[PDB]
Design a protein around this nucleic acid. Structure first.
Ligand SMILES: Nc1ccn([C@H]2C[C@H](O)[C@@H](COP(=O)(O)NP(=O)(O)OP(=O)(O)O)O2)c(=O)n1
Ligand SMILES: [Mg+2]
Ligand SMILES: [Mg+2]
Length: 430
DNA sequence: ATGATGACGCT
DNA sequence: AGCGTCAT
């Protein structure tokens, strides 16, 4: 009882932009606003590959990874914006710059952890402490939570969505203990007030809408965020966890969407996260390892300790291109020309990064894929990154990979290359 | 023939 | 170091 920790020590939010690359293109081009529309890369192969989809287009069944020619069969009026192409490859600069707009606004509120191009975790524990003291001891109005859902409410003894949202919010607020500055539910509620402010600032200052989750840890905040996307935020309290997890497929929890989650399901013969509570910690560690077993034992009870790391900037800067099917690179000079294209984009990004962020990368990682292999990378080699010079980086990358060539000729490359990747890593202050 | 990314764990 | 998992 008195000594069982409940994982309620922190307030953590996750903010995730709604259909992010689409909103970037819709801000730029008002003709795309409030329309079914998608962002595509490489127009020549089947209209291009879809990498982002507006909610109007999702209603027709358009998804990521669809070819645009195929998406047009579901949604004949679908509008498209194409990713910029530079040096024969997709160039994601516009979306990285738009990401920086959002991450700089979030950082005014709390130190962030950049988790992807369009999301960040926030540890609001300290901001909440300070807002609680400024708040005297006065009630939190529903008006301060105009886009907040309380997961699991309403419950107990309306037929539209907004009606239900408010009924649940009313039940929550009506039962809150405001005189107790250490109540975790009160802390989450104040965290949600702050996230409303944060989301209003992002939309005001950028034009972009987003969703968010507010809970006691990263996994629950991430799960919470997706429950009422788009343009809404969701509070998942500790008390909401048993019911929420009772029908929650294991693969929906972050880090369990792959082979480990499949093995949890297969080895234990279960489907839902809540069902994990019936195993001892030792039993879970016996199947999945010490670290995973302890993580699962705590996570299925809503408890997780992974900190919000103070990191706003990516740790690596990389440039990648595939060469699928018949386009696989088969000669030495093809290989050199494309390494050079990659290296030129990398230099551009590295130089900008050194001026903006006062650091330099010191290691260059070169990765390739061979036709016939199975995996994301076939082979990775590093060397020193001592100069931001594209001809030197590309010459160096060739040097460290040039013996992967099984060909007995000089001018040919075998087995042909289906992917090249350059990645700058190991940053030092500058 | 989705692709272009990016963090982090195991060894 | 170099490989693999998981993720957007
Ligand atoms: N596999 C993926 C997933 C996302 N992305 C890019 C495009 C997306 O707009 C952006 C953010 O990914 P996301 O958060 O998973 N989805 P998106 O923001 O488009 O829509 P929501 O479902 O979050 O509203 O990363 C990508 O290029 N490849
Ligand atoms: Mg998003
Ligand atoms: Mg995201």
């Amino acid at each position: 009882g008195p000594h069982m920790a409940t994982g309620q020590d922190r307030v953590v939010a996750l903010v995730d932009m709604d259909c992010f690359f689409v909103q970037v293109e819709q801000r730029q081009n008002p003709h795309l606003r409030n329309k079914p529309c998608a962002v595509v890369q490489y127009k020549s192969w089947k209209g291009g590959g879809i990498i982002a989809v507006s909610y109007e287009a999702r209603a027709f069944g358009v998804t990521r990874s669809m070819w645009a020619d195929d998406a047009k069969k579901l949604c004949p009026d679908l509008l498209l914006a194409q990713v910029r192409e530079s040096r024969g490859k997709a160039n994601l600069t516009k979306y990285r710059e738009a990401s920086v707009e959002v991450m700089e606004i979030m950082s005014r509120f709390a130190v962030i952890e950049r988790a992807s191009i369009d999301e960040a975790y926030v540890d609001l524990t300290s901001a909440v402490q300070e807002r609680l003291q400024k708040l005297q001891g006065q009630p939190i109005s529903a008006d301060l939570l105009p886009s907040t859902y309380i997961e699991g409410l309403p419950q107990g003894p309306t037929v539209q969505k907004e009606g239900m949202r408010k009924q649940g919010l009313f039940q929550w607020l009506d039962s809150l203990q405001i005189d107790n500055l250490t109540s975790p539910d009160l802390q989450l509620t104040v965290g949600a007030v702050i996230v409303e402010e944060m989301r209003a600032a992002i939309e005001r200052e950028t034009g972009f809408q987003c969703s968010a989750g507010i809970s006691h840890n990263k996994v629950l905040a991430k799960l919470a965020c997706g429950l009422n996307k788009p343009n809404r935020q969701t509070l998942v309290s500790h008390g909401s966890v048993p019911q929420l997890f009772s029908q929650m497929p294991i693969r929906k929890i972050r880090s369990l969407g792959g082979k480990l989650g499949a093995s949890v399901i297969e080895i234990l013969g279960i489907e839902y996260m809540g069902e994990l509570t019936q195993f001892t910690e030792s039993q879970l560690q016996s199947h999945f390892g010490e670290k995973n077993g302890s993580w699962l034992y705590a996570m299925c009870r809503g408890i997780e300790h992974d900190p919000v790391k103070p990191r706003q900037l990516p740790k690596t800067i990389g440039c990648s291109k595939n060469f699928p099917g018949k386009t696989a690179l088969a000669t030495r000079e093809q290989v050199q020309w494309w390494l050079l294209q990659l290296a030129q984009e990398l230099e551009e990004r590295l130089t900008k990064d050194r001026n903006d962020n006062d650091r330099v990368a010191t290691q260059l990682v070169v990765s390739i894929r061979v036709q016939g292999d199975k995996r994301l990378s076939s082979l990775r080699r590093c060397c020193a990154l001592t100069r931001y010079d594209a001809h030197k980086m590309s010459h160096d990358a060739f040097t460290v990979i040039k013996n992967c060539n099984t060909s007995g000729i000089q001018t040919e490359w075998s087995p042909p290359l289906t992917m090249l990747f350059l990645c700058a890593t190991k940053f030092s202050a500058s």
